[PDB]
Amino acid sequence: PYWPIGVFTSVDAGLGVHLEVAQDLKVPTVQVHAPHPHTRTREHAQAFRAKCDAAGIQVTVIFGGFDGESYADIPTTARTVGLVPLETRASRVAEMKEISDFASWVGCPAIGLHIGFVPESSSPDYSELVRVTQDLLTHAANHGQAVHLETGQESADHLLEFIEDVNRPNLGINFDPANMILYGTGNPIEALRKVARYVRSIHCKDALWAPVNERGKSWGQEVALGTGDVGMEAYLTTLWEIGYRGPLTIEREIPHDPVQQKKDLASALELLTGLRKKIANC
Numbered sequence: 001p002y003w004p005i006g007v008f009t010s011v012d013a014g015l016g017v018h019l020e021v022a023q024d025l026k027v028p029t030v031q032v033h034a035p036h037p038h039t040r041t042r043e044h045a046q047a048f049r050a051k052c053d054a055a056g057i058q059v060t061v062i063f064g065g066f067d068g069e070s071y072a073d074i075p076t077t078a079r080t081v082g083l084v085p086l087e088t089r090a091s092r093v094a095e096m097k098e099i100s101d102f103a104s105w106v107g108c109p110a111i112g113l114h115i116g117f118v119p120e121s122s123s124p125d126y127s128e129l130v131r132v133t134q135d136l137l138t139h140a141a142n143h144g145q146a147v148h149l150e151t152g153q154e155s156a157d158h159l160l161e162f163i164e165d166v167n168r169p170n171l172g173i174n175f176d177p178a179n180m181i182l183y184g185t186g187n188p189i190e191a192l193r194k195v196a197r198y199v200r201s202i203h204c205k206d207a208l209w210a211p212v213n214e215r216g217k218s219w220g221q222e223v224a225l226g227t228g229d230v231g232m233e234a235y236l237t238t239l240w241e242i243g244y245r246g247p248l249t250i251e252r253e254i255p256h257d258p259v260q261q262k263k264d265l266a267s268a269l270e271l272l273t274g275l276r277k278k279i280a281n282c
């Protein structure tokens, strides 16, 4: 079946709803933020796969996230997030490999990462970043896994350049159109067309642009699915055209307001279900 709906969940770490909420909503699939280090063993992975099995839920992607990452503002994100910052790089690379091990024990084919703010290709740290990415891709390949880059601050052109430089068959994209509005970088539907051949999974999330003069400086604003500037019908109709049949994974990050987060997941589910019926005929 095309476009099974999903929600982005957390066991402990991360901004997703708990699995019990995915169950209540009766979604068939989830993406999962990887658990904290102490909850990451093989015995934990086997318990988690048993829990998803009992719930009738398939885990499509397991996402990395790390201590010391801060999204507080755009400059802090560039400074603290992903594999890019030098201080935390070795530690986060090793963590992504443990997350790959955990995903393998769980039986999940893919892991995902916001790699951070990718340097200009002329930069000396660019090449080092390519080399750690290739290294992580080898580790994942040995598990039969793909790595999906989460949509970042990079323009679609820069991202394509990076992907082309890494040049590995198991590297792909988790496409998040709201992120490009939040960073204020470029029109998300146009970027989707440009990167189409690398898209392996997606997030359905919405956002409002920052004021014109504040783009790339102040964050835009994340809002309930369909109430923002993405164009949900435009996004889904374009996904259909490029051949994407995989899960539509709803992401709404307001775990601080669990009740409203669940409400927005439920209205998102209704909106996507109607659009799926119209566009995909199911």
Ligand SMILES: [Cl-]
Binding pocket: 193, 194, 196, 242
């Ligand atoms: Cl295209």
Ligand SMILES: [Mg+2]
Binding pocket: 150, 176, 179, 203, 205, 251
């Ligand atoms: Mg996302």
